[PDB]
Amino acid sequence: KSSCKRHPLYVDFSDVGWNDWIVAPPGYHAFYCHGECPFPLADHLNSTNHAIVQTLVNSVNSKIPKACCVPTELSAISMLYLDENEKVVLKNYQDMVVEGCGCR
Amino acid sequence: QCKILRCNAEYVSSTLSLSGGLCRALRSYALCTRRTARTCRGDLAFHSAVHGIEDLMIQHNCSRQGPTAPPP
Ligand SMILES: [Cl-]
Ligand SMILES: [Cl-]
């Protein structure tokens, strides 16, 4: 099975009915993390000692799950939304785009 | 001092390009850990690697030495 990495995810605001409050953009590249977290994890510098220990414990006890592929780095995006009197307002939204994936 | 990142990298590299082949890669991984053992005494990733190699070698029933070429 494919190991922990970033996958494409374009979020279309019309498809989620968000085009009514989001003036701009019409959507964005959000991405997502997905993939197996097999030993050795320590070939990545964005994992953790706890994830390394959990993987070791999992190998001895299958009831304890393996680490999970999640975003380890996120970036912000600016969006325009409608305020009172139909005023278009620019606002920065943190942790919107996946920049890195890792096993945690 | 501790050179476990290089052992991890080499093993991940070897397994991306592909049980006989995995056992070779695991033996190279084991050799690599033994060669940096002296500089990884207190390294957590090192001791996790040594555990993982043994676990993986028990699975796939790897030999610790690797086959000799027989006489002509
Ligand atoms: Cl590891
Ligand atoms: Cl918000």
Curated annotation (Swiss-Prot), chain A:
It is found in: Secreted. Glycans are attached at N46. It comes from the Eukaryota. Disulfide bonds join C4-C69, C33-C101, C37-C103. Particularly abundant in lung, spleen and colon and in low but significant levels in heart, brain, placenta, liver, skeletal muscle, kidney, pancreas, prostate, ovary and small intestine. Homodimer; disulfide-linked. Interacts with SOSTDC1. Interacts with GREM2, RGMA, RGMB and RGMC. Interacts with ASPN. Interacts with MAFP5. Interacts with FBN1 (via N-terminal domain) and FBN2. Interacts with type I receptor BMPR1A. Interacts with type II receptor BMPR2. Interacts with SCUBE3. Interacts with TNFAIP6 (primarily via Link domain); this interaction is inhibited by hyaluronan. Interacts with ERFE. Interacts with BMPR1A/ALK3; the interaction may induce HAMP expression. Growth factor of the TGF-beta superfamily that plays essential roles in many developmental processes, including cardiogenesis, neurogenesis, and osteogenesis. Induces cartilage and bone formation. Initiates the canonical BMP signaling cascade by associating with type I receptor BMPR1A and type II receptor BMPR2. Once all three components are bound together in a complex at the cell surface, BMPR2 phosphorylates and activates BMPR1A. In turn, BMPR1A propagates signal by phosphorylating SMAD1/5/8 that travel to the nucleus and act as activators and repressors of transcription of target genes. It is linked to Brachydactyly A2: A form of brachydactyly. Brachydactyly defines a group of inherited malformations characterized by shortening of the digits due to abnormal development of the phalanges and/or the metacarpals. In brachydactyly type A2 shortening of the middle phalanges is confined to the index finger and the second toe, all other digits being more or less normal. Because of a rhomboid or triangular shape of the affected middle phalanx, the end of the second finger usually deviates radially. Short stature, facial dysmorphism, and skeletal anomalies with or without cardiac anomalies 1: An autosomal dominant disorder characterized by short stature, facial dysmorphism, skeletal anomalies, and variable cardiac defects. Distinctive facial features include midface retrusion, short upturned nose, long philtrum, high-arched or cleft palate, and variable degrees of micrognathia and dental crowding. Skeletal anomalies include patterning defects of the axial skeleton, characterized by 11 pairs of ribs and brachydactyly of the fifth ray. Belongs to the TGF-beta family. This is Bone morphogenetic protein 2. It comes from Homo sapiens. The lineage of its organism: Eukaryota, Metazoa, Chordata, Craniata, Vertebrata. The gene is BMP2. The chain holds residues 293 to 396 of 396 of the full protein.
UniProtKB/Swiss-Prot annotation, chain B:
The modification Phosphotyrosine is found at Y11. It is found in: Cell membrane. Autocatalytically cleaved at low pH; the two chains remain linked via two disulfide bonds. Also proteolytically processed by TMPRSS6, several fragments being released in the extracellular space; regulates HJV activity in BMP signaling and thefore iron homeostasis. Glycans are attached at N61. Adult and fetal liver, heart, and skeletal muscle. It comes from the Eukaryota. Acts as a bone morphogenetic protein (BMP) coreceptor. Through enhancement of BMP signaling regulates hepcidin (HAMP) expression and regulates iron homeostasis. It is linked to Hemochromatosis 2A: A juvenile form of hemochromatosis, a disorder of iron metabolism with excess deposition of iron in a variety of organs leading to their failure, bronze skin pigmentation, hepatic cirrhosis, arthropathy and diabetes. The most common symptoms of juvenile hemochromatosis at presentation are hypogonadism and cardiomyopathy. Interacts with BMP2 and BMP4. Interacts with BMP6. Interacts with BMPR1B. Interacts with TMPRSS6. Belongs to the repulsive guidance molecule (RGM) family. This is Hemojuvelin. It comes from Homo sapiens (Human).
